[PDB]
Design a protein around this nucleic acid. Structure first.
Ligand SMILES: [Mg+2]
Ligand SMILES: [Mg+2]
Ligand SMILES: [Mg+2]
Ligand SMILES: [Mg+2]
Ligand SMILES: [Mg+2]
Ligand SMILES: [Mg+2]
Ligand SMILES: [Mg+2]
Ligand SMILES: [Mg+2]
Ligand SMILES: [Mg+2]
Ligand SMILES: [Mg+2]
Ligand SMILES: [Mg+2]
Ligand SMILES: [Mg+2]
Ligand SMILES: [Mg+2]
Ligand SMILES: [Mg+2]
Ligand SMILES: [Mg+2]
Ligand SMILES: [Mg+2]
Ligand SMILES: [Mg+2]
Ligand SMILES: [Mg+2]
Ligand SMILES: [Mg+2]
Ligand SMILES: [Mg+2]
Ligand SMILES: [Mg+2]
Ligand SMILES: [Mg+2]
Ligand SMILES: [Mg+2]
Ligand SMILES: [Mg+2]
Ligand SMILES: [Mg+2]
Lengths: 56, 114, 121, 209, 120
RNA sequence: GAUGUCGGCUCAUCACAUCCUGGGGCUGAAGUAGGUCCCAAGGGUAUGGCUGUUCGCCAUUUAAAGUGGUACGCGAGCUGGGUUUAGAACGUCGUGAGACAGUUCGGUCCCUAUCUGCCGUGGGCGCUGGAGAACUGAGGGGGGCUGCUCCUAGUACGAGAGGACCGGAGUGGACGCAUCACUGGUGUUCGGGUUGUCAUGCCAAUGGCACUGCCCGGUAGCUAAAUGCGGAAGAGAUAAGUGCUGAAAGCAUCUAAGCACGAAACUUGCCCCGAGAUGAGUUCUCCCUGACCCUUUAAGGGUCCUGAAGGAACGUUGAAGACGACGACGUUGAUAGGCCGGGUGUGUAAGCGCAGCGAUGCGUUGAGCUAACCGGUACUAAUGAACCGUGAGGCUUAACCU
RNA sequence: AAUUCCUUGUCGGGUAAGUUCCGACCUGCACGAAUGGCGUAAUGAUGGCCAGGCUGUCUCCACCCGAGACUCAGUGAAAUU
RNA sequence: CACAGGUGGUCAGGUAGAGAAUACCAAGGCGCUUGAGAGAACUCGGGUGAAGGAACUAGGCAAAAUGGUGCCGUAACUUC
RNA sequence: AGGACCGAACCGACUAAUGUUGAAAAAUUAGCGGAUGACUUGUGGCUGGGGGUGAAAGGCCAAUCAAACCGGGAGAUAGCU
């Protein structure tokens, strides 16, 4: 099966309407450090919910 | 669950004696008949077995008049009434479906004997 | 029990294997067991007997493998299907004796003649 | 009459002194305090909104507890109407129990549904499987010929063909009642009602004879 | 539909999910920390904890059986002896997860399985 | 500058010149059963043997095995048996190449779907302040089958044989829906037996590989052959038909005036969807009542401060699920995992002891092990934040009002 | 009959029922003796028919294990128009 | 094409086995240059199936089955 | 002994599925036929186009064959599109 007609550039976009991306609804900062880390998991240096796991 | 189980054991009977997949037993159920109510006996050989609380089965091989019969009693059923044990045997298996196609000699199930 | 299906004979005359060429009891009626009427076709018969091979009469299923459960739920199942031949036009058994145990399902006041024979249930 | 909102959690025997085993779904109706009455001059009909459970008083939104507190507050799973007529109930949670279906033998039971989802014919429409063998290329079990041809042109609606199978009211009607044993919010039917345990059911007298 | 079916099949025979988990569990009992896949962890979870639980008790009995799983007759020592009595009081949370996810090649989300008592 | 043939399969949809079932007229209609005509399209409407068949004949069923339209419905859905490629042979015709509206054996069936169309399922925005809900129900769809037995009543009818009506009761066939409690199936995540071989130093005990190696049995879940329930009653207006009273037309007449019955059709009753019903509906509840400027000022545009109800997000997850969606839970916690105890299933572990020359047996032991289960338990993981949404809601008229 | 149009000839056998099959009849549309006639043990991935075993071929599908399908990240076509 | 195809010769360990079959291994060489999840219809390759057992179909197509050594025993017909 | 039997290598190609913008311009998988012989294979050689070769299908003669490929007559001719 093929297209009997060439889809207009217009229609093409309509399809890419829901193709857009999303943001991040803002992330999170740690308490033990201003660690600008992702919500619910390890900071840039072993930290997370306070404390600090994984050396270095 | 919690409501059940208790609502189940609420019907369960305690007249049920010891069992085994090799035992013989002789279940005695009702019959009703025409205007009667006689108790029909059914001495056989347990092959499979219940073990599900109120919900329980027997599965007993007998081999009546020439042909073999198999009955899956429902342990906790008013129709079950009495249920002997007769001869207990050693099997070393949970289900004796293998004891199916056998017949004399090839079926001979060595008694338990404790 | 459905077309074909070779069942033994629980009565005498025209012994051994007999094929069910139809399941009477309505359109599309799939299978039949317990104690239903079945169109049989003697495929063995005995040297003498009363019904010879090739005969196409009717019969009643006396024993099935799918057993027969009753109220309580407990089921009764025999090993090997069996039926009993009987006059075509006006029911009732053709043989005199009935071998093997039967079931209380035939206690119907229309098959009495059979349950009244030695065996069991 | 009106009915009560229960919660599926049954399926168990109940042998009789006669020798019969009766199947049955154990519906649980723990009171149904009417959360609000609906008038025909104020609303437009004759109904009685009720509840049965009681949220953890945490997930209860103010707009929710606002409607409850407005009347006989006491939280609960949700709100359920019950169109009635020629007989009302005390607005505030008058509290109706399983003893309601006392001199009753009808019942309907309206759970959610199954939940197959996957769909696909042969199961959602009880279709027929094509030649398992004897050739047949990539067409063992499939729709096969959905329409007709040029004359028809399109494909008539309703054309059975796969699609989500599950989650949908689907009542039952009838179902002889076994025991209305109250003082434990217990009600037993004949057996086989929709839902899959812990489901919200709407048991009420069968509209049918 | 899997309705109410427990257990994760990752993506391979019921054989792989007996080694890529056995070599992992044993690999966990060693360093007490790992940066595996989130799922490949939440699963590994109910693989070691059971072993540790089984580790609570000694005896050749609950030993050889412990040797059955994890053919490492070495880490079995780490069990019963080391982390054996270590968690000889814990309720079962012998494991942490420490999420982080997102690997290089595959956008796959990694994790950090670790013995609850690893920090020193 | 290609619209794939016949039959089958699968899946249909309509017509009515109706096969069954429902309602009536006439009868060469005693009853039972028929014959024929009128009405009626709700639903239903056979398995095999022979053949490529369609059809047909035959066997045996059924309430019945309807007729026809749909590219003689259906190959970007299946087949490829018939039939038109190339091989080969027979009968036949031709000197022959070859040929046949004769036969015979053999003979490559492509396509990842853009558009309409369907079946499902989300994302926007709109419904005039914003929310969380519960309904109303315009409409739309689903379903609409029928056997036998008994009671009536061995009565009415009939010479007998035979044998009803109306009405009532029970149990089936086929079909649909739901559900795993039962009966079973599956159960490569549970237990066991065992062949070959490799390995863990060896004995013992184990694991790997050989279709899960082969195999026995099985929890949850899912299921049908298992189990429960439904096609109704009742109304409305009728079809054909039947009539009352009734003149035109002194009678007669169902019609012209004028009333009464009347079917599985039709409207509704039963089940489900449903306010995008833009004709966007109703009811209940919840939230926000701080300040300025520029003006092209009847509206705006912008500023600081504020961000509510709620929402979404993230995480633990589900009998929910393709992904979105929907449900539960997030330390004010059982939402998952682990853990504890039980259950279940397997079937009496390992080690030791003893007996036997040994295979092996017995004891410890009914053990050992035990997934999706049940009861319970914060050990682990479910962070405090932050995020979006605001700040009393246009005009005109009427009703009320100080 | 690898030859028969009429043709599913007729009869018999097999089946519950057999336009195929096997044994016959002869009315050979239109067999026939090295473009060989009729037989023939053995052989055949050869044509037809029958049966026992076997079974998901089917009644009527159910579950289960894998590779795709679906989601994410990287690469990135096609016919057609 | 860093293509599941084609390509002649030589060497020939252990256990089991008739064996250059086959299975597990040694020496030796490899995991095939997208992966991570999920656990839908449907397609592909498989495993298990209640009762029936060729009713399938143009046709038993495909499946399922049978399968080893020793011994016993084995029909018509026959070119023996 | 044998164009003998069963069966790997080896030669072949009867069946089905899958592939059909393939892994592949004929394969993969499960079966299948021959397997001391008219066997099978390496290397080199000889037959050349109206000619060769052919256990005979119009088959093969470099993915081409009822007359190969390359170049030329050549802008063949084309009442046709
Ligand atoms: Mg193909
Ligand atoms: Mg049109
Ligand atoms: Mg008409
Ligand atoms: Mg027919
Ligand atoms: Mg036949
Ligand atoms: Mg056509
Ligand atoms: Mg095709
Ligand atoms: Mg053909
Ligand atoms: Mg393996
Ligand atoms: Mg002949
Ligand atoms: Mg000739
Ligand atoms: Mg991508
Ligand atoms: Mg490569
Ligand atoms: Mg079966
Ligand atoms: Mg057939
Ligand atoms: Mg057929
Ligand atoms: Mg075959
Ligand atoms: Mg096979
Ligand atoms: Mg040879
Ligand atoms: Mg091959
Ligand atoms: Mg050979
Ligand atoms: Mg050469
Ligand atoms: Mg060539
Ligand atoms: Mg010239
Ligand atoms: Mg030119």
């Amino acid at each position: 099966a093929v297209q009997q007609n060439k889809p207009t550039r217009s229609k093409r976009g309509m399809r890419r309407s829901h193709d857009a991306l999303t943001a991040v609804t803002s992330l999170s900062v740690d308490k033990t450090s201003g660690e600008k880390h992702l919500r619910h998991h390890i900071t840039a240096d072993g930290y997370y919910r306070g404390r600090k796991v994984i050396a270095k | 669950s919690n409501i059940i189980k208790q609502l189940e054991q609420e019907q369960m009977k305690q007249d049920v004696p010891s069992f085994r997949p090799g035992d013989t037993v002789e279940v005695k159920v009702w019959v009703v008949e025409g205007s009667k109510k006689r108790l029909q006996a059914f001495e056989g050989v347990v092959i499979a077995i219940r073990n599900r609380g109120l919900h329980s089965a027997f599965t007993v091989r007998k081999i009546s008049n020439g042909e073999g019969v198999e009955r899956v009693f429902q342990t906790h059923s008013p129709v079950v009434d009495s249920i002997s044990v007769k001869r207990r045997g050693a099997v070393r298996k949970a289900k004796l479906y293998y004891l199916r196609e056998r017949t004399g000699k090839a079926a001979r199930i060595k008694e338990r004997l404790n | 029990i459905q077309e074909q299906t070779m069942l033994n004979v629980a009565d005498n005359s025209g012994a051994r294997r007999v094929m069910c060429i139809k399941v009477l009891g309505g359109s599309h009626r799939r299978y039949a067991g317990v104690g239903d009427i079945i169109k049989i076709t003697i495929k063995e018969a005995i040297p003498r007997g009363k019904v010879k091979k090739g005969d196409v009469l009717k019969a009643v299923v006396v024993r099935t493998k799918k057993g027969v459960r009753r109220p309580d739920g407990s089921v009764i199942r025999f090993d090997g299907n069996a039926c009993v031949l009987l006059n075509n036009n006006s029911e009732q058994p053709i043989g005199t004796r009935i071998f093997g145990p039967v079931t209380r399902e035939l206690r119907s006041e229309k098959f009495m003649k059979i349950i009244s024979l030695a065996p069991e249930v | 009459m009106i009915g009560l909102v229960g919660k599926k959690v049954g399926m168990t025997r109940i042998f009789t002194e006669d020798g019969v085993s009766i199947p049955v779904t154990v519906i649980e109706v723990e009171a149904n305090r009417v959360t609000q009455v609906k008038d025909l001059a104020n609303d437009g009909y004759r109904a009685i909104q009720v509840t049965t459970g009681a949220k953890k008083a945490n997930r209860v939104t103010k707009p929710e507890a606002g409607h409850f507190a407005k009347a006989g507050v006491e939280a609960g799973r949700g709100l359920w109407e019950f169109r009635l007529a020629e007989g009302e109930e005390f607005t505030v949670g008058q509290s109706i129990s399983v003893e309601l279906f006392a001199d009753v033998k009808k019942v309907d039971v309206t759970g959610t549904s199954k939940g197959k989802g996957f769909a696909g014919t042969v199961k959602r429409w009880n279709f027929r499987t094509q030649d398992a063998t004897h050739g047949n290329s990539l067409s063992h079990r499939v729709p096969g010929s959905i329409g007709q041809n040029q004359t028809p042109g399109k494909v008539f609606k309703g054309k059975k063909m796969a699609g989500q199978m599950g989650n949908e009211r689907v009542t039952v009607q009838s179902l002889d009642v076994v025991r209305v044993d109250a003082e434990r919010n217990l009600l037993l039917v004949k057996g086989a009602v929709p839902g899959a345990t812990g489901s919200d059911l709407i048991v009420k007298p069968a509209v049918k004879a | 539909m899997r309705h109410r079916k427990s257990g994760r099949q990752l993506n391979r025979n019921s054989s792989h999910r007996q080694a890529m988990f056995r070599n992992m569990a044993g690999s966990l009992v060693r360093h007490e920390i790992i940066k595996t896949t989130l799922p490949k962890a939440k699963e590994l979870r109910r693989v070691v904890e059971p072993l540790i639980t089984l580790a609570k008790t000694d005896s050749v009995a609950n030993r050889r059986l412990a040797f059955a799983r994890t053919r490492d007759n070495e880490i079995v020592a780490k069990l019963f002896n080391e982390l054996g009595p270590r968690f000889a009081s814990r309720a079962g949370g012998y494991t942490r997860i420490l999420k982080c996810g997102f690997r290089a090649g595959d956008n796959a989300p990694m994790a950090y399985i670790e013995l609850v008592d690893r920090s020193e």
